């Protein structure tokens, strides 16, 4: 295409594209490096398929990885969503820190980094112990607590290195940092999944139907993700004379899916917590029943999963948008929806807008989240695929946002002038 | 019958949403499929390269 040749003609855009690709090569290089005392052959023997590499296994229908980047930035994700939930009328110090401005925000960012290190340590301990139980105690050689804390501190060092790499690739690179690293994790898992689907193989036309359905779902995801309900906003603090246009008018855009993917975080925590607390109690009748009904590849568990995605989309849409804080900010800065009094009436106006938009966005999110179950069941795919889950939403969003960032860097060169 | 009135309101609300038109929909899908295909090939090639260098160095 012409536009990717226009990018590489500007030197700054090409400079940060090449820096981003070098940081992704660094991330992949580190994903090949094993952990200290983890005895890689029993790890590579644990899988149910044949992945590429020795640290990549196909466990639980997912491409698991046990390098020094085994956690990825997942502790940063869960630390940020916990800190964000704590800002909203639970911990008061965080509330006033958010209320301060761009310096109390730095206090919240510092707390999120320290909480990231703490949660990365706890997750690395749980992950190494659970993987060692999965291998039968054979995964860790010398299973003493000094070796577990060595493994935990090196996985936490890997995750903190990935966060530094994200800071680099957002300072000197193409876009957001952590989002590019998450995108890299997903689409670096893609080629071995394609190799498994090839190593499996009416089937050629079945995979052609699957690829056409994947392009159809990518089009539907772009359609919902790029759609805003634009509420018009009128400001009554400038004279606005001399024929105001009306084309670039001020508005307040609400997304159709304002929550994002975070409702699936809350729904899968609600779906994994009963099997772990039943796994601590040993095998019984009710332990096996809890394990059988909270498994979302079977219709009772899929129904509980869909219901929790819809309910947590409503909760997190009203957490993310917060129509009361929106109405107060609109009243304070002097704007108003035309026709609606700027106090409580705009709060309940945009509350009604948010109820309807959140219904459509929650149904889209639940359908996207239970799509890979249907592709695996009704396309005879291997269960390794997870083809069209919320990783599809993450991939589409990061691709489109990086493209928009690049075109915004591009247009600063094209200031024409009437003389030319 | 409040729920059918609510669903009429949802359908009425969806016509005020500014959905993307067909030209930018096609351009966006082109960018998304180009990015996914390029990074699939890029990551396959550097996995092959790191694997050969790892086989050399051990």
């Amino acid at each position: 295409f012409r536009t990717i040749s226009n990018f590489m003609r500007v030197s700054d855009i090409r400079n940060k594209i090449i820096f981003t690709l070098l940081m992704l090569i660094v991330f992949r290089i580190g994903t090949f490096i094993p952990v200290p005392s983890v005895n890689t052959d029993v790890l590579k023997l644990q899988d149910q398929l044949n992945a590429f590499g020795v640290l990549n296994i196909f466990c639980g229908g997912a491409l698991q990885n046990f390098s020094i980047f085994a956690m990825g930035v997942m502790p940063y994700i869960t630390a940020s969503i916990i800190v964000q939930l704590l800002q909203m009328d639970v911990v008061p110090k965080f509330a006033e820190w958010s209320k301060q401005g761009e310096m109390g925000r730095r206090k919240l960012a510092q707390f999120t980094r320290y909480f990231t290190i703490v949660l990365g340590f706890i997750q690395a301990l749980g992950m190494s112990y659970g993987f060692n139980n999965l291998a039968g105690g054979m995964l860790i050689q010398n299973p003493g607590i000094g070796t577990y804390l060595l493994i935990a501190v090196v996985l936490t060092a890997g995750t903190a290195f990935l966060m530094w790499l994200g800071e680099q690739i957002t300072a000197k690179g193409v876009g957001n940092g952590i989002s590019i690293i998450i995108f890299a994790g997903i689409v670096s898992g893609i080629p071995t999944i394609l190799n498994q689907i090839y190593a499996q193989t009416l089937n050629i036309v079945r995979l052609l139907l699957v690829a056409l359905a994947v392009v159809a779902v990518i089009v539907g995801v772009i359609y919902i993700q790029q759609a805003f309900r634009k509420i018009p906003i009128q400001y009554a603090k400038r004279l606005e004379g001399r024929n105001p246009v009306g084309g670039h008018s001020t508005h307040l855009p609400l997304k159709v899916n304002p929550a994002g993917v975070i409702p699936v975080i809350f729904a899968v925590s609600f779906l994994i917590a009963p099997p772990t607390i039943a796994s601590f109690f040993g095998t019984n009748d009710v332990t096996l029943w809890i394990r059988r009904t909270f498994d979302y590849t079977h219709p009772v568990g899929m129904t509980i999963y869909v219901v929790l995605i819809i309910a947590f989309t409503y909760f997190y849409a009203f957490v993310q948008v917060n129509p009361e804080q929106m109405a107060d900010n609109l009243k304070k800065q002097g704007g108003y929806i035309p026709g609606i009094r700027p106090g409580k009436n705009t709060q309940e106006y945009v509350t009604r807008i948010l109820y309807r938009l959140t219904l459509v966005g929650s149904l889209f999110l639940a359908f996207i989240a239970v799509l890979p179950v249907f592709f695996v069941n009704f396309a005879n795919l291997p269960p390794s695929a997870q083809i069209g889950g919320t990783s599809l939403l993450i991939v589409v969003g990061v691709a489109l946002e990086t493209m928009k960032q690049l075109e915004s860097q591009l247009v600063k060169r094209h200031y024409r002038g009437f003389i030319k | 019958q409040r729920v059918t009135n609510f669903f009429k309101e949802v359908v009425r609300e969806l016509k005020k949403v500014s959905w993307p038109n067909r030209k930018e929909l096609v351009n966006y899908t082109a960018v998304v499929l180009a990015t996914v295909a390029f990074f699939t090939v890029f990551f396959a090639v550097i996995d092959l390269g790191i694997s050969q260098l790892i086989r050399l160095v051990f």
Partner: nanobody
Amino acid sequence: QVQLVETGGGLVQPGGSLRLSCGASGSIFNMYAMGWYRQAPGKRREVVARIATDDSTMYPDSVKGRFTISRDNAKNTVYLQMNSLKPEDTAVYYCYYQRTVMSQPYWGQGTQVTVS
């Protein structure tokens, strides 16, 4: 690259003993890991025994004490001496090697140890 002829698979009464012999071809054996796993029907193979290059042997607590390992270099045999057999120890068996810590573990053929 190194073929494994794994012999010694015989029907033993449950409560006996057996010897499994993994005969390799190439003789360097400065290898990162050697060992044995099962992969019975009712899958997800259990790694039964594993020798490091420092002979630092590991076992799971399923077969701990009951199974012993042995590796004599320059005479390409890896021995798994099974003691105190049981009806749930009935499985096919596979020897394995792994050259270095970044290698890929290359398996052998099946050795059906049927304990009944």
